[PDB]
């Protein structure tokens, strides 16, 4: 719900999934055939400073990062689940087919009417020695953003959770994708802040592996993101500083 500590205000909304009428409408806006079966459009995890600036994590902004419908599946598929109004577009990026997997490289939504966090590159990494350090967790919360079962072929889910310590907090946004017998993909966004500092660290990693390369691993781990992660090669890794405004 609401958690306060000085100038920081933490907000967590957990409600029912989006209704059909609002799903089709939003899907049309984002130029997608549909949304994940379980679309928690009213859910959020929000971190906000008294100054106004902050960062939040919601399902809608996450879906904006997903490759939308290009009209290529008409060639790739004998029959489609649903059609879609093809997206206007295009960027200078190579056109790739929609894949119904809802893969997203979303890293959170920056908040602020005027004052706002500035995203800058950094050579810093989130120090795991600080993460492994065990102070008492003052506040903990986990929020589900969306989930889909890929027409019973696996799972695609986006969730976010946060640890609040006496003088720091640590957040993990995780996109997890498993296509049964095919592949496992995991996009993690880690957010760290120390009380004294005037910045946050945000470390993004994208991992993925074909299941054929994971056959030495106990199959039970395929349904456990925390355990399977170490077996997945990192294909993209970015670390940025989120500088506090003056």
């Amino acid at each position: 719900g609401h958690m306060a500590s000085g100038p920081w205000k933490l907000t967590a909304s957990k409600t029912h999934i989006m209704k059909s009428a609002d799903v089709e409408k939003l899907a049309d806006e984002l130029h997608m055939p549909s949304l994940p079966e379980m679309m928690f459009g009213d859910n959020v995890l929000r971190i906000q400073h008294g100054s106004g600036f902050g960062i939040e994590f919601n399902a809608t902004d996450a879906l904006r990062c997903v490759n939308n419908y290009q009209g290529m599946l008409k060639v790739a598929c004998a029959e489609e689940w649903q059609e879609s109004r093809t997206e206007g577009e295009h960027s200078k990026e190579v056109i790739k087919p929609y894949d119904w997997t809802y893969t997203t490289d979303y890293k959170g939504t920056l908040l602020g009417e005027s004052l706002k966090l500035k995203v800058v590159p950094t050579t810093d990494h989130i120090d795991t020695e600080k993460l492994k350090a065990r102070e008492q967790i003052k506040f903990f919360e986990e929020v589900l953003l969306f989930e889909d079962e890929l027409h019973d072929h696996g799972v695609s889910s986006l969730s976010v959770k946060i640890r609040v310590m006496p003088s720091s907090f640590f957040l993990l946004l995780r996109f997890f994708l498993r296509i049964d017998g095919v592949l496992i993909r995991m996009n993690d966004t880690r957010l760290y802040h120390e009380a004294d500092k005037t910045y946050m660290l945000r470390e993004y990693t994208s991992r993925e592996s074909k299941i054929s390369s994971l056959m030495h691993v106990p199959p039970s781990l395929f349904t456990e993101p925390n355990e399977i992660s170490q077996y997945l090669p990192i294909k993209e890794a970015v670390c940025e500083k989120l500088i506090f405004p003056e």
Partner: peptide
């Protein structure tokens, strides 16, 4: 709960 001390996730990494």
């Amino acid at each position: 709960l001390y996730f990494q």
